[PDB]
Curated annotation (Swiss-Prot):
The gene is ybxI. The modification N6-carboxylysine is found at residue 50. This is Probable beta-lactamase YbxI. Its EC number is 3.5.2.6. One of its GO terms (molecular function) is beta-lactamase activity. Belongs to the class-D beta-lactamase family. The keyword Hydrolase applies. It comes from Bacillus subtilis (strain 168).
Amino acid sequence: KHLNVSKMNVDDEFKDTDGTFILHDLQKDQTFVYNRKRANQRQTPQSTFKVVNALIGLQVKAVRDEYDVKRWDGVKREFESWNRDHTLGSAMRESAIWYYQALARDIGEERMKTWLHTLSYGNEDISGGIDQFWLQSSLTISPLEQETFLEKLAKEELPFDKPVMKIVKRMMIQEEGDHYTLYGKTGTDMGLGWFVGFIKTEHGSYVFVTNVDDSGTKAKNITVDILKKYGLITS
């Protein structure tokens, strides 16, 4: 009764949404892809880039750990959850862009470019500016390239320190149930939505990448519906 990802079908979940979905079974080494053409199209990563930003920032000690506090300046920004003191981990959870812009400025161009080159991270183009390049700007990456990177993060086959990789994966936890742990990060801009991450169950471990012509919230809802359908999200 164990999941064979090659027999999946997600047509129903995408009935009224243009998008792509990738699920990689880490232990069997098997992948399901819906809409391979779209999976190959590069797009701006938006806030899915926080995963990379956090890895590089911890690696070069621009931030100390998931609890490194940056005080809010008191400026009311677009979402109330941004208008508070944040840590590296809480700013990932709430997608507080201002925190990760300060982090990118501290990382700086040279270290950002060098470490981004180790990840095969799409076109690796940061010319849009040190604190702007992942936000509807120069950097683009395809869903397949996101999957390849996240698979290497899951396997810790990246040149980062191992504790750095474990901290960033922990910061991505969205739900810890009795029988599964869901990891993920959303991105959204101009009718393109991402939800990328991992799910660990009692019987397997998986990487997923979802990208849609809709919000990141929609991308996440589609992903959760698929993972529920195939019994990976239960309780």
